[PDB]
Design a protein around this nucleic acid. Structure first.
Lengths: 75, 100, 141, 115, 191, 144, 55
RNA sequence: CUGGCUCAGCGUGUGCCUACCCUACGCCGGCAGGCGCGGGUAACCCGUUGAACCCCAUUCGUGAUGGGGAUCGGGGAUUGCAAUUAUUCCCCAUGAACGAGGAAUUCCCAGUAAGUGCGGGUCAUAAGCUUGCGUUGAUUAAGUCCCUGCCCUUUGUACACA
């Protein structure tokens, strides 16, 4: 039938999407970012940890099972 | 003087009458009594099958046997409490007078 | 005023293990790089400097309850012996690891093998443990 | 066809060996087996198997020595004998080449059938 | 806080159950205002004692199912907490209000059943009680989020948020509303 | 750091074995028949190799040296009780076995016990259960 | 030796070693609290030893 | 999966012939184990029985995968007078079907179902069984004779070893 092959590391244009897009989403989770960029949950987490430490997305809660961020406020 | 009378019995009201009798005897002989300290009851439990064969529904028998332990500590020279404890014995309980 | 029980006991092990790695005078054995931590485990520790984490854990357990041997440390670090197809059972921790961690905390003057068996905590240790508790409280305040 | 070897020991060096070197040589179970004690109680019959094997003929194959044993380790001392090992019903006529060393004397029998 | 009891950090007051029928069998307001889903219970003691359990606890109870997760209410409480965070982000409403709306929209009105003139048999249509409405509403959106999460990257907290948002909307995309409309259709087909 | 580097070894080859680069290195080198997760992790420890990288991202010199580590155990201070062939009947040398070397020794050992006519070898010939399992109701997909 | 063979076999353990103190057979023995009475013989004499069906 | 944090209740324990007890603690060994001195005939010692699930923090990322661990190879300990047709246990390696299960069918309504581990029995060695114990802890129902059973009243009879 059908199979899923996500990226272990970013393609140039996929990272260009990530650097442009995922700070526009209201809900930022590694599972959401994994589906929305065709990337393994390991890549999703590592990328969103970059985005946070960089200082771009506002984290709401961390937990071993569930890590949730949002787009930072406007004003 | 510090002497340890322990009473080990399978029946309860037997043990209670012996505990009462030794307090009565102690307070009459005018010596300091430590009241009947009740150690936890030990319930010897054996559970077997009922049927001698194995051609029935699996029904088990739950056999129990409680054993009760009291002790009274007194401040008395051996003799007078030895003669208190040499009278009024019944078949149920068992006596131990410990000196040291 | 701060003591060990006032602070989060999770990050206290991290703080002591970090302090004891900085000291780095802790007689660490050479089979660390190849060992499995209990027979009930399948893999080796994911962390590479685990010895100083376990040394922190052992030390704070001797703080809370003194007079612990190594058989107490094999017990306390028990888990599930997942027996493949048979039912799971409880299994103890490793004797050699717990014993050499206590002896590494004895090689350093932080424990004291007290009378009535086992290891107690030494005045230097309790002073050390309470001071870094104050450091942990300050960091989280 | 190239002359095979135990652990790293020539077959005649196995032959020229005391029991404690032969212990450390073969596998764990058999080390314990011989370390437990010596054979003069029940294994008075092992002293008899020693006797029977070490009573060998001139340059011609030895007489088939029957055995009511299956719990006997084959040492270099007993290599190259014809023996009947008891099936309960039958004695199984087999020779014990040096490849049977450190193996149980019983471990050459079958009892049953495939339909 | 001696006045208001914010559920973790969600307001009790300013949540209204619009439907008159499901109003008694939904506990969210003023006396069932509690900090945690977790509690002792004794709601299986007598018949309609169950109606007085906070709907958040009713959801927390119904969630822990399929054998391997029988009696893990702490794990279920953290799932409901994460779901309420995620609902608030994507929606922007009171998560308790969105849940209450999803309960109303998911509960069926009519179901098919076997009746009498005893001899042969007959499958006619009948009503569902306001308790049965809320009972089946909770079960539907719980099993919807459950089976959606099975063999998937979308975590149970995200799948619950999806079901409760889409069911509160009345989408026909949530398993809740899909199955509701299947039962009401069959109920019509033989009434 | 997180974008695909050039010369990302997508398909590595370690002893004629098509190993993936996409898998993490500790769980990737266990594709070889004779190394598990245990032996993989301790070797990627013994060779000072950072196991935070994928098997696409490591360098060719690091693949060479770690293959020398896997074949040569005691030259890099690894225990004797860790090996899958310990105190062999022939050489008496405790030595680890790799990909095809296992299949060599396995074929030899089965033919060995078969020709010396041990009951264990006889059950292996008949293809039955050999460690003394009850086969009244088990191993039926085996014989159709 | 006949007398070296008659009771030659050792009995330190197994159920051939221990015996019912009443009927002398080797199945379903009660060994709890040092009873050493087979389950049928136990159940027969149980009320005389002191054991009582309460619960 | 790897660390860290944290809480039980029932028991049992040195033997008649009978040999075999429960174990703390100090060293040795990665591990199963070995040696040393001790307590206990037990609300006294093992013991405040630091149990598991659960909890917190990582690594994994929908791939018959770090799921699952059958089958098989090699070595090492313990029990025994003796283990091959592997007693058991440990260490490395091998990695089978199995993607929620057809007809049919079982048990069950509150600290219950279920998940979870700990004791007793058998026991030189010893739990995938059974008999008890606590820990986490629900959905549904407060109804009926539709199904399967058994039980009654009325009625009919030339049956009564029915």
């Amino acid at each position: 039938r059908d199979k899923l092959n996500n990226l272990v590391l970013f393609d140039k244009a996929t990272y260009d999407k990530l650097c442009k897009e995922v700070p526009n989403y209201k809900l930022i989770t590694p599972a959401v970012v994994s589906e929305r960029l065709k990337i393994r949950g390991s890549l999703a987490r590592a990328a969103l940890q970059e985005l946070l430490s960089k200082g771009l997305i506002k984290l709401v809660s961390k937990h071993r099972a569930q890590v949730i961020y949002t787009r930072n406020t406007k004003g | 003087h510090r002497i340890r009378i322990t009473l080990t019995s399978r029946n309860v009201k037997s043990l209670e009458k012996v505990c009462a009798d030794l307090i009565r005897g102690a307070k009459e002989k005018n010596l300091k009594v430590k009241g009947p300290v009740r150690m936890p009851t030990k319930t010897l439990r054996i559970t077997t099958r009922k049927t001698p064969c194995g051609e029935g529904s699996k029904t088990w028998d739950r056999f129990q046997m409680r054993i009760h332990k009291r002790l009274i500590d007194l401040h008395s020279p051996s003799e007078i409490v030895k003669q208190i404890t040499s009278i009024s014995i019944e078949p149920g309980v068992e006596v131990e007078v410990t000196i040291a | 005023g701060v003591t060990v029980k006032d602070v989060n006991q999770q990050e206290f092990v991290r703080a002591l293990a970090a302090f004891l790695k900085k000291s780095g005078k802790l007689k660490v054995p050479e089979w660390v790089d190849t060992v499995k931590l209990a027979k009930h485990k399948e893999l080796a520790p994911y962390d590479e400097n685990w010895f100083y984490t376990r040394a922190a854990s052992t030390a704070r357990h001797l703080y809370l309850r003194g007079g612990a041997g190594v058989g107490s440390m094999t017990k306390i670090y028990g888990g599930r012996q997942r027996n493949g197809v048979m039912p799971s059972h409880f299994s103890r921790g490793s004797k050699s690891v717990a014993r050499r961690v206590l002896q590494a905390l004895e090689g350093l003057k932080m424990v004291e093998k007290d009378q009535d068996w086992g290891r107690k905590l030494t005045p230097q240790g309790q002073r050390d443990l309470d001071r870094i508790a104050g450091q942990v409280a300050a960091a989280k305040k | 066809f190239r002359k095979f070897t135990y652990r790293g020991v020539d077959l005649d060096q196995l032959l020229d060996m005391s029991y404690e070197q032969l212990m450390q040589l073969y596998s764990a179970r058999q080390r314990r087996r011989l370390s437990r004690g010596l054979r003069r109680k029940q294994h008075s019959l092992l002293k008899r198997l020693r006797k029977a094997k070490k009573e060998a003929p001139p340059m011609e194959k030895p007489e088939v020595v029957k055995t009511h044993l299956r719990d006997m380790i084959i040492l270099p001392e007993m290599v190259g004998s014809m023996v009947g090992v008891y099936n309960g019903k039958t004695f199984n006529q087999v020779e014990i080449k040096p490849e049977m060393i450190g193996h149980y004397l019983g471990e050459f029998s079958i009892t049953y059938k495939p339909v | 806080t001696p006045d208001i009891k914010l559920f973790g950090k969600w307001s009790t007051d300013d949540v209204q159950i619009n439907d008159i029928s499901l109003q008694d069998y939904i506990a969210v307001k003023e006396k069932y205002a509690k900090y945690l889903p977790h509690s002792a219970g004794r709601y299986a003691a007598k018949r309609f004692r169950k109606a007085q359990c906070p709907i958040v606890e009713r959801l927390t109870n119904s969630m822990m199912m399929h054998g391997r997760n029988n009696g893990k209410k702490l794990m279920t409480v953290r799932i409901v907490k994460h779901a309420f965070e995620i609902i608030h982000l994507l929606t922007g409403e009171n998560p308790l209000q969105v849940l209450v709306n999803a309960i109303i929209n998911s509960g069926p009105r009519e179901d098919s059943t076997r009746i009498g003139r005893a001899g042969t048999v007959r499958r006619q249509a009948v009503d569902v009680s306001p308790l049965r409405r809320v009972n089946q509403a909770i079960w539907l959106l719980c099993t919807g989020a459950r089976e959606a999460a099975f063999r998937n990257i979308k975590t149970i907290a995200e799948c619950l948020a999806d079901e409760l948002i889409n069911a509160a909307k009345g989408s026909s995309n949530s398993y809740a509303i899909k199955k509701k409309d299947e039962l009401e259709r069959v109920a019509k087909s033989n009434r | 750091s997180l974008v695909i580097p050039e010369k990302f070894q997508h398909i590595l080859r370690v002893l004629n074995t098509n190993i993936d680069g996409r898998r993490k290195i500790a769980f990737a080198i266990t594709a070889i028949k004779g190394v598990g997760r245990r032996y993989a992790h301790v070797v990627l420890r013994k060779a000072d190799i950072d196991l935070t990288k994928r098997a696409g991202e490591l360098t060719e010199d690091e693949v060479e040296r770690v293959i020398t580590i896997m074949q040569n155990p005691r030259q890099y201070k690894i225990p004797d009780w860790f090996l899958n062939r310990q105190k062999d009947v022939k050489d008496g040398k405790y030595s680890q076995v790799l990909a095809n070397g296992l299949d060599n020794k396995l074929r030899e050992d089965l033919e060995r016990l078969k020709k010396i006519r041990a009951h264990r070898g006889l059950r292996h010939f008949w293809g039955l259960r050999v460690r003394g399992q009850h086969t009244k109701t088990t191993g039926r997909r085996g014989r159709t | 030796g006949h007398q070296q063979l008659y009771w030659s076999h050792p009995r330190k353990f197994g159920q051939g070693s221990r015996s019912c103190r009443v009927c002398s057979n080797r199945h379903g023995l009660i060994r709890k609290y040092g009873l050493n009475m087979c389950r049928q013989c136990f159940r027969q004499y149980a009320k005389d030893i002191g054991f009582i069906k309460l619960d």
